[PDB]
Every structure is written in structure tokens, then in C-alpha cells.
Structure 1
Amino acid sequence: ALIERIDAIIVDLPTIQQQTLVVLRVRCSDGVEGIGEATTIGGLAYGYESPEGIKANIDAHLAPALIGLAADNINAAMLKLDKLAKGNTFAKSGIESALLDAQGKRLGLPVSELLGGRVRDSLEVAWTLASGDTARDIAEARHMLEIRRHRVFKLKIGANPVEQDLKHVVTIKRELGDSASVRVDVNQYWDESQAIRACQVLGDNGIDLIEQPISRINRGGQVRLNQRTPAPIMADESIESVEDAFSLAADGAASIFALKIAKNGGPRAVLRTAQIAEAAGIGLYGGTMLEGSIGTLASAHAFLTLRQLTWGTELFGPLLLTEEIVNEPPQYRDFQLHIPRTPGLGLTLDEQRLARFAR
């Protein structure tokens, strides 16, 4: 089987205002087509790759290089892209995901099987409390706990005065008590001078982990916080490649790594980061860039092969979408995401919805 065609479609989907995704379709000579997803959050704010640049680069450089190569030699295809292109992990993630989807369908096996074999069939899924209103957040958390959908919550902070964000988080934790795990994500917003007292308060008031309190540019401060923060520090934005992860582990910059296929280069590349982490004794967390079912499931097939994910995952992207361009709704039940053992990613494109939302 040879790679015959690769399409990159930008889609704008409505949310509970809209999430933009880059859907990849790779048609192989044997009639099999694989699908993948390259998604990011708000244009360029969460990465150098935007949906437009991703499409531009796939069309102009990445796809032309693969047409005519064997579909079933995923290693050769990706190694070729690395040689031709520096970075561009989001784009490479979608392509790898599509190639793995296609190979799974072709052999009748699920992607996790191609990746070695699963050790579980479901994954714990956290939930971001996003209203900004403390009371609403508490109400929402209790509701999600009642319907058994989530029991691990995450608050995004850093954009308001430190004391304001602190008050918010500590209040939600006191109210929920030991009924739920509460974590925070600062997304590099604080500088070390701010993080010093903040991490102390958070750690002292029951917050389980602090995700990326300061900027990736301050490597030394990450090492110091990793030694002094009462709550463990998780690296997210500091990881923009498998080599970054090695670098962070050697320095003792964090005790937990967020695993994101988009920042590593696909399902196989995230397993390298995970393995570097495992070799050094660093805890794992299944991360997301809020992708729909394709990218969420591609991430999921990889995480199912992992020995332990001490902190669970945050694969809730599909729950934020009102519409999807896939026909099979994901299974969220009893605090987890359940993954089928069907061929490939086990997804089928909703051609009607794809045409409607494509731009």
C-alpha cells in the first residue's frame, strides 16, 4: 500500500464560541483511508502553529514528501518529515494519527495494539471548571460528581491578581473537600517571584498539583519550585519536543509531565516522552489541546499502553463540542473515557457535518 493522497481541512465547530480543528484524510492505494487531527487553542497563543499555517505547511511541504511512500512504514514516513521539517509537531501529530488509523483498519487492529497493546480499556477524565464564578464552579463540580462524570477538577488561573486567583481556588477546594481532587493550571502566567508564595498557599490548602506555574524560559526557577513547592509541579509548556522532556528530567525540573501528542509529534512520539519519564521516575498525566474525538482517541490509544498515569488524563475535548465531524460519540461513563478495541481509531467521518463546517 502506498500513500496516494493527503487532505488538510480546517473546520470551525460550535462549543457549549468555536473550536477550530485541522482534519487530515490520508488515502492509501488499497482503498483504506486514515483520519487524523491537528488542533490548537486560539490561533497562535498556545503554540507557533495555527490552523492556517498547519494547512499551509501540510499542503506545500509535508504531504508532497510522503506521496508515493509505503503507507505501512510509519517509522520511515515520520523520520522523513523530521529530516525535512524542524518542529511542526502539531502537523506531524495529525499525519501520524492518520497513518496509524489507516494501518489499524488495514490489519483489523486497534491503534493501541499497533502501539504495543493496552493495559486498560478506560481512562480517568478530569474536568475544567471554567465559569470564573466561584459559586457556579462549586455547583458544577457537585453536579458532575452526582452524575458520576468527573471527580477531578482543574482551574485555570494566572490572569487575575494572585490573591484573587488564590481566594477562588482555595474556596472551591474547601467546599468540595475530600470528595474531589482539585488541581490548577497557570499556563506560564506567573513569574517566580509570584509563584513562591502562591505555590505555598495552594500546596497548604489541599491543591494536588500545580501545572506550569512559570514560564518555560525560566529553567532554574522550575528546578527550585520543584524542590520547594508543597504541591508537585507538572511541566506542560516546557515540553515542546521529546528532547525537551529529556532535558527537563535530567535537570529535575518537574516531578510530573503532561503528555500531549500535539506538542510531541503524534501518538508514537508521546510514547517516547512517556518512556523518558518512566526511565527517570517522573509521574505522568494525559494532556489535551482540546481536540475532538479523532485527536482525543489518538491520544487515548497511546495512553492505554502506559503502565501508570498517576494523575489521570484531561481528555474532555469532545464534551465541549456541540457538533462533531465524526459519527461515533465517545463513551464517558463513571468518571472515565472508554475505548473500543475496534480497527484503527474506530471512527468514521460524518461527511455531511464535515462539508457543513469546513471553511
Structure 2
Amino acid sequence: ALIERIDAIIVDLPTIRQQQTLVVLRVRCSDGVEGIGEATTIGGLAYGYESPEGIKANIDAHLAPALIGLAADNINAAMLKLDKLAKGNTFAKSGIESALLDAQGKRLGLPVSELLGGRVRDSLEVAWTLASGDTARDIAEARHMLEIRRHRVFKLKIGANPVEQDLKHVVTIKRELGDSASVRVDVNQYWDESQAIRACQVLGDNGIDLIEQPISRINRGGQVRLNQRTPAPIMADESIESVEDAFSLAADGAASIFALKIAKNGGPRAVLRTAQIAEAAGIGLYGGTMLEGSIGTLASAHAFLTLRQLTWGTELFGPLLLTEEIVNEPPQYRDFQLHIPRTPGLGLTLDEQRLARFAR
């Protein structure tokens, strides 16, 4: 089977929060099998180098033409060719690798997790981000998610308000939930090391389970110091923009936990290279997301199912924020987890009608 055509479609979907843009890839092979992938990011260029528009432009002008005519079943050769021709562009590469694995799974009749070696579990613990901004509303939401047994691990995005304000807000939530839930924070590189010194202490002292990316990736030394001094473990996220960054952080002792994102590494197979490095170093894992819809979520999920251990769970809740999707199969979230079927490929099929309706 040869790769015949690759299409990159920008889709804007309404969210419960007010819109999420995804780049849906469709790779059609000569044997009639089609694979689907997703390259999605948050806020244009605010959370990475690649925007939806840039991703589509590069796929159309550079990445896709390099693949037309190649064997669809030799994913390693195709991805290595992209590395040779394109520097970075991990989101685009991720969408493409996801589609090739999907097409390959359908072709062989195996779920992507089995193509990657075999799953050691069928479900993944899923965290939820509390985003009402209001403390009372956040505790109310958390208590609801617990009641319906959908989530018991909650993440709080902070760093935008005065430190003292964010600290009170987080400590209040953990204090009210007590031992019923795990509370973590994500600072998204918003603090400088001078602010993180005291903030990490207060959070660690008040039962916050982990602190994700407290300071900017440009401060390597600061990450190493906080890794050694913060009472709560430090998780690296934005500090990882490639597999090679993961080796560097591991060699430096810059974090005790790595967030694994297929978009930041370059696909399901690339994220596994980063996970393996973390494993060889004794670094804990967490399955991250870029707020992908079901396609990217499932592609992440399929790689995470093969991991020996994910000490801190995952935040694969992306599909839950969308009011509408472009696939026919809704994800199964129940009993604090995301359940992944043993269907061929990613186990998803496009809803041609909603796709046409939301595509640009």
C-alpha cells in the first residue's frame, strides 16, 4: 500500500468553556485504507511554535509532498524522511504519524496500542482541570465530578494572578476536598524562580501533590534547584519540546516527573522514546494533552496503554470540553477513567457531515 493523498483540514469546534481549532489529517492509501490524525494546539502561537494555519501550510507545501508515493506500511522510514527534511514541526509530524498508525492498524486489524508493542491495561486515569476562576464554583464542580465518579484528580492552572491570590485559591480547594481528591497545579512557566521559591513551599506544605512547570524552560539551573528543594515534586512540561530535551532534563536532574505529549515530541512513537528515557532514568510519568479532541486523545491513549507505569495518571479530558466532534464514536469515560477499546487503528471514523459543517 502506498500513500496516495494527505489532506490537512482546519476545524473549529465549539467548547463548553469558546472555540477549539484542530487540524485533522486524512491519509488515503492505495489499498483503499484511510488513516486519520490530529495536530492541535492551544491559542494560536501562545503555547508553541506551530499554529493551525502554519501546520496546514507546512503539511501542504512541504511534508505531504515528501510522502506521496512512499510505502504506507513503513512508518519508521516515512517519519525518518520527515526528520531529514524538516526541523521541529512536531505537531504536524504527530498528526501525520497518528494517521499512518491508524491506517496501519486498520490494515492489519490491530489497535494502534498493539502495533506499538502491546497494551498492559485497557483504561487510563483521567484528571480534570478546574477552570471557573471562582473558588466556590471550583469546589462545587470538583464535588460533582467526584459524585458522578468521573474524576478524582484535579488540576488548577495558576500563575496569572498575584502569587498570594493563587495560593489562597488553591489551598482553599485542597482544604475543602481533603483526602477525597488529588489536587495539582500547573503554573505554565508564569513564575520566575524568585517567586517559585516560597510558592512551592506553601503548596507542598498544604497537600498539593505536584507542581507542573513552575518556571520558564529557559531557566535550567532554576529547575534543577527547585527539583532539589520543593516539598512537592516538580513536573516538566513546556521544558520538553523534543525527545532530545527529555534526555537533557533527565541528565540534569531538572524534574522528577515528565508530562508526555505526542504533539511536543512528534507522535505516538516519539512520545514512547521520551517515556523510555524517563524510565531508564527513574523519572515518573504523566500522560499530557494539548486539548486534543478524540482523535489526538486516542492516539495519545494508545501509546500510554503500553507504558509499564504512569505514577501520576493522565489529563486526557480534551473530548469532554467539546460540544460537537467530528468522529462517530464518543469516548468512554467512567469510573475516573478513559476506556480504550481493542478495535483496529484508533477505533474512530469521521462523521463526514459534522466535518463539512465545522471545517474552514
TM-score, scaled to structure 2: 1.00
The alpha-carbon deviation at position 134 of structure 1 amounts to 0.1
1:305-332 residue CA offsets vs partner (Å, 9 max, x unmatched): 0000000000000000000000000000
1:286 Cα shift?
0.1
Could you list the structure 1 runs, at least 4 aligned residues long, displaced by more than 2 angstroms after superposition: none
Measure, in 2, the Cα distance between the counterparts of 1:34 and 1:172: 43
The alpha carbon displacement at 1:76 in A equals: 0.2
Instruction: Indicate the SS of the match to 2:99.
Output: helix
Q: What's the counterpart of residue 310 of structure 1? A: 311
1:209 Cα shift? 0.1
**Residue-by-residue CA offset, 1:111-158 (whole Å, 9 max, x unaligned):** 000000000000000000000000000000000000000000000000
Alignment of 1:145-294 (within 5 A): 145-294=146-295
Q: Please report how far the alpha carbon of residue 238 of structure 1 lies from its aligned counterpart in structure 2 after TM superposition.
A: 0.2
Give, in whole Å, the separation in 2 of the partners of 1:129 and 1:234: 19
* Offset at residue 346 of structure 1 (A): 0.3
Residues 179-204 of structure 1 deviation map (CA, whole Å, 9 limit, x = unaligned)? 00000000000000000000000000
Cα displacement string for residues 30-49 of structure 1 (whole angstroms, at most 9, x for unaligned residues)? 00000000000010000000
Deviations 1:229-273 (A, max 9, x none): 000000000000000000000000000000000000000000000
Taking only aligned residues, the RMSD between alpha carbons, in angstroms, comes to 0.2
Match of 1:43 in 2: 44
Matches of 1:139 and 1:68, distance apart in 2: 54
Which runs of 5 or more structure 1 residues have no equivalent in the other structure? none
Q: 1:211 Cα deviation (Å)?
A: 0.1
CA distance in 2 between counterparts of 1:347 and 1:159 reads 37
- 2:290 and 2:225 map into 1 onto residues whose CA distance is 27
Report deviation, 1:27: 0.2
Report what 1:97 is aligned to.
98
For residue 13 of structure 1, give the secondary structure of its aligned residue in structure 2. strand
Per-residue CA distance 1:8-34 (angstroms, 9 max, x = gap): 000000000000000000000000000
Using the TM superposition, give the Cα deviation of residue 166 of structure 1 relative to its aligned residue in structure 2, in angstroms.
0.3
Unaligned runs of 5+ in 2: none
Q: Distance in 1 between matches of 2:239 and 2:45?
A: 16
> Distance between the aligned counterparts of 1:204 and 1:73, measured in 2?
51
Alignment-derived partner of residue 338 in structure 1:
339
Corresponding residue pairs, total:
359
- Identity of matched residues, %: 100
Distance (Å, rounded) in 2 between the aligned partners of 1:347 and 1:178: 37
Residues 263-310 of structure 1: CA distance to partner in whole angstroms, max 9, x if unpaired?
Answer: 000000000000000000000000000000000000000000000000
1:345 CA displacement: 0.1
Offset, 1:65: 0.1
Q: Structure 2 CA distance, aligned partners of 1:140 and 1:62? A: 43
Cα deviation digits, residues 42-61 of structure 1 (max 9, x gap) = 10000000000000000000
Q: d(CA) in 2 for partners of 1:322 and 1:350? A: 14
Secondary structure of the 1:310 match is coil
Tell me the distance in 2 between the aligned counterparts of 1:147 and 1:104: 34
CA distance in 2, matches of 1:235, 1:141: 25
Aligned residue for 1:154, secondary structure, equals strand
